[PDB]
Amino acid sequence: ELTVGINGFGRIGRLVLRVCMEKGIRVVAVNDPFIDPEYMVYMFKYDSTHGRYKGNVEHKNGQLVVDNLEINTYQCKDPKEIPWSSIGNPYVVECTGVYLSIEAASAHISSGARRVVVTAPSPDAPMFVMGVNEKDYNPGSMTIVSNASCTTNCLAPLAKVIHENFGIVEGLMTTVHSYTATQKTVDGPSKKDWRGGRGAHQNIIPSSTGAAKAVGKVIPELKGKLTGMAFRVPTPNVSVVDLTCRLAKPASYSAITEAVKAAAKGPLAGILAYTEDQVVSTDFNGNPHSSIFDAKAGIALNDNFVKLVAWYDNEYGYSNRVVDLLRYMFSRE
């Protein structure tokens, strides 16, 4: 059926595997040049933020075995050398962060991948946010695709609802974001992101993200109407979007919440959720949604100028969307 190969067994690769297991999608191979099979077992079995894997994990004859599913493993430094074609022609999830362009990722294709999903923004690959524009995917012309960013996946669904109901004249986004693997435990080297080299654990760290502007790629009507930035703070997971926007049509705060509520119950079900509870970040650790609107946290200056709040599990929600995109793409073959 749908079969999946994963390149890179970092945080995304591992959670993607977990999600595939949960959604019953067959993973046929994992490739990582650095992480051997016995070590894969350990990294998958135990997880500091998401807990122990709820099934069984073992290594056998150079294979990763998860709940009796035997998964091939490779240690190729070059995508070109991965034998995708010898193990069916799976969809490939590209999680290394190193092959973002269509040209770079196309290496997978030449080695036998039927299609490729890049788990990061791409300079040129078509970008998709489930619930927003996946229907623009076209199998006739799109062999390599991007699932955008965790952040864009949180903001876009919310921007869609607000724009379609009220009209976003212009918006500026801040994401208060958990620290990540690219960061440092103590002040260390990060030569093209100096602030990002500073102790992740000790600091609030300003960061530049194209995540808000990129919404204009999945919602063309918003091109040039959004940008923003980030603060990385000392939490290990879960992040929050803080969107300040001016609306075309005037909207009471209650009209806004009612619109979001309706979207969550209906067309954006499973993508955008809604809460009125007095929640905090940990309440969304392990939440599969792309975006959870926080009604009570937001505030309006007036009917045309408002600040909207939405939570996202930047690891798990995004990983869930990657698998959702694979499934959708496959339904379109």
Q: Contact with its own copies (CB under 8 A): which of 286, 303, 327, 330?
A: 286
- Among 72, 137, 279, 330, indicate the residue that binds its own copies (CB under 8 A): 279
Cβ proximity to its own copies: between 48 and 138 the closer is 48
Residue type, 242: D
| Near its own copies in 182-201, by CB under 8 A | 183-189, 191, 194-195, 197-201
> Can you point out the beta strands (E) in the chain?
3-7, 26-31, 57-60, 63-66, 69-74, 91-94, 115-118, 144-146, 168-178, 205-208, 226-233, 239-247, 272-275, 291-294, 299-302, 305-312
Using rule CB under 8 A, residue 283 touches its own copies: yes
With CB under 8 A as the contact rule, the residue among 203, 255, 259, 303 that binds its own copies is: 203
Q: Is 208 in the site for its own copies (CB under 8 A)?
A: yes
Residues 332 and 35: their CA atoms lie apart, in Å, by 34
- Give CA–CA dist 297/256, Å, rounded: 13
Identify the residue whose tokens are 């091109």. Answer: 223
Closer to its own copies at the Cβ: 149 or 239? Answer: 239
Give Cα 154 to chain centroid, integer Å. 9
Q: Among the candidate windows 62-70, 110-118, 138-146, 164-172, which touches its own copies by CB under 8 A?
A: 164-172
If the CB atoms of residues 157 and 298 are measured against its own copies, the closer one turns out to be 298
H helix or E strand, kind and range, residue 103:
helix 102-110
The answer to whether 245 is annotated as binding is no
Structure tokens at 285: 């650790």
Q: Of 52-91, which residues contact its own copies (CB under 8 A)?
A: 52
Nearest to 91 by CA among 128, 130, 51, 142: 142
24 counts as binding its own copies under rule CB under 8 A? no
Q: Are 241 and 173 in contact (CB under 8 A)?
A: yes
The residue (of 264 and 326) whose beta carbon lies closer to its own copies is 264
User: Does 96 belong to an annotated binding site?
Assistant: no
Determine if 231 is a binding residue for its own copies (CB under 8 A): yes
Nearer to its own copies, 26 or 303 (CB): 303
Residue 299 contacts its own copies per CB under 8 A: yes
| 282 makes contact with its own copies (CB under 8 A) | yes
- Residues annotated catalytic, as ranges: 150
- Is 110 a binding residue for its own copies by CB under 8 A? The answer is no
Distance, in Å, from the CA atom of 88 to the CA atom of 125, rounded to the nearest integer, reads 24
Please check if 207 is assigned to a binding site: no
Report CA-CA distances (Å) from 116 to 17, 109, 144, 304, 306: 16, 7, 5, 41, 39
Beta strands 272-275; 291-294: pairing state:
parallel
Q: Minimal distance in Å, beta carbon 310 to its own copies?
A: 11
The annotation status of 3 as a binding-site residue, yes or no, is no
331 binds its own copies (CB under 8 A): no
Torsion, Cα of 51, 54, 60, 64 (10° steps): -70
Q: How far is the CB of 300 from its own copies (least distance, A)?
A: 8
Query: 205 a known binding residue?
Result: no
